[PDB]
Each structure stands twice: as C-alpha cells, then as structure tokens.
C-alpha cells in the first residue's frame, strides 16, 4: 500500500507547517523589464518566460510537500500536470494581496487590469485573479494558511481524473489548528475552512479559463512555448 506508514501522516500540525514553509519556492524577478507599452506577443512572452522558470521551482517544492513523493512517479506527474496553473495562480494572488487593483507577477512586473487589454481575453482572467487577491485580503489570509491551501491544490486537483485523501485530511487538521491558535471560535474555524476551500473552486475555474487561453495562444503561434510548457498544455488537451 503506497503511503501506508508515511511520515506525512505522523507529522504534528506545527511540523506540517514547518515542512511546507521550508518547501517554498523563491519569488522570481522577470529576467527582462518590459518596454512601454505592451504588445500581445511581449506580454505573453514575459508571462510564459516567468511561468516556465516558476515550473522548474514548482517541481522542487512539490517533492518537499509531505505525502507527494510517497506516490508513484506516474501519479506525481498527473498531479503536477493537473495542478500547475492553479498553483501559479494561488501564488500570484497571494503575492498580489498587498497591491490593490494590481497583479504582482514579479516584484519588477506589477500589471493593472488596463495592461491586461494588450492580450485578447486576458482582461477577464486578470479581473478574476484581482477578485481572488481581493477576497484573500478581506479574509486576512496568513502565510501558514496559504502554503496549506497550495498543498491541497497539488493533492486535490487531479485526485478524480486514498493515501492522497489521508494527506488532505492531515492538511485540513493543520488549517483548523492554525485557526484555533489565532483565537477563532470553533464556529469561526469551520466557517473559515469552508470560505478558503470554496475559493479553491474559483482557482480551478480560473485555471480552466487560463488553459483555454494558453491553447488559443499555442495555435496563433504568437509566442514560443518551452517543451515543458507544451507537455503541461497537452495533458489538459
């Protein structure tokens, strides 16, 4: 039985948060400053260059998420294939919380919604990302809560496309503990858990619209895509 006996299932909530924080990827700068204004091709070029670089670090992070390397390489591939854009997106909205009306793609690449017009159908996605960022800001989402949610996205997003269920239960326990220690009543805890988990359905939704966008940009041949990025896209069709 894969996972049976895992360290992941033995962790305390404090040890699971410690493992998750230790696993965090670096915050990447754009290798290029963009000239003003943007074209469709220079915009998609920056964003696909960035996402490519974030993917490499995402793979390192995934390996250091408790429960993950207890799966077959087959299942690890399928979860990363299913989750990668939702994980890019939860990171983007987390980093963008302290920048109202803007998406901090990188410390040196802050875009507002108008700059999203430079790409056909990008403004709708930015609007949805801004709202998610804005909801997290409303909710005062904490660092520790964020890494828990990013782990759930990883483990959950391809889980129906049992050890995975046991690790998710472990992450649910950890979220509730973080909420209890911050002095939320049981009522406020259950309500907060549900509010954050409901946002994940919206991240899934933005991911699915994102992927249609990314496939439409593959066909237009507007910008080169890395082999890794072409594989990720093929996995969704």
């Amino acid at each position: 039985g894969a996972g049976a006996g895992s360290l992941a299932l033995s962790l305390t909530a404090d040890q699971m948060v410690s493992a998750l924080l230790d696993a965090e990827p670096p915050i990447l700068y754009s290798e290029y400053d963009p000239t003003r204004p943007f074209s469709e091709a220079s915009m998609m070029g920056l964003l696909t260059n960035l996402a490519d670089r974030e993917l490499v670090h995402m793979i390192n992070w995934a390996k250091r998420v408790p429960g993950f390397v207890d799966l077959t390489l087959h299942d690890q591939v399928h979860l990363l294939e299913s989750a990668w854009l939702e994980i890019l997106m939860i990171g983007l909205v987390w980093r963008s919380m302290e920048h109202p009306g803007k998406l901090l793609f990188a410390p040196n690449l802050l875009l507002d919604r108008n700059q999203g017009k430079s790409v056909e159908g990008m403004v709708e996605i930015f609007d949805m990302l801004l709202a998610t960022s804005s909801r997290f800001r409303m909710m005062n989402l904490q660092g520790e809560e964020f890494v828990c949610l990013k782990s759930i996205i990883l483990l959950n997003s391809g889980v129906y496309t049992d050890h995975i269920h046991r690790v998710l239960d472990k992450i649910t326990d950890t979220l509730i503990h973080l909420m209890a220690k911050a002095g939320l009543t049981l009522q406020q805890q259950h309500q907060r858990l549900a509010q954050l988990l409901l946002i994940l359905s919206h991240i899934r939704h933005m991911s699915n619209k994102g992927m249609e966008h990314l496939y439409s940009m593959k066909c237009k041949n507007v910008v080169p895509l890395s082999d890794l990025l072409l594989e990720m896209l093929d996995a969704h069709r």
Partner: peptide, 8 residues
C-alpha cells in the same frame, strides 16, 4: 516527457 525526468 520532461516532468518524469525532472521528478525522479
């Protein structure tokens, strides 16, 4: 498949 090689 790059992801298999990068994940092993």
């Amino acid at each position: 498949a790059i992801l298999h090689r990068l994940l092993q």
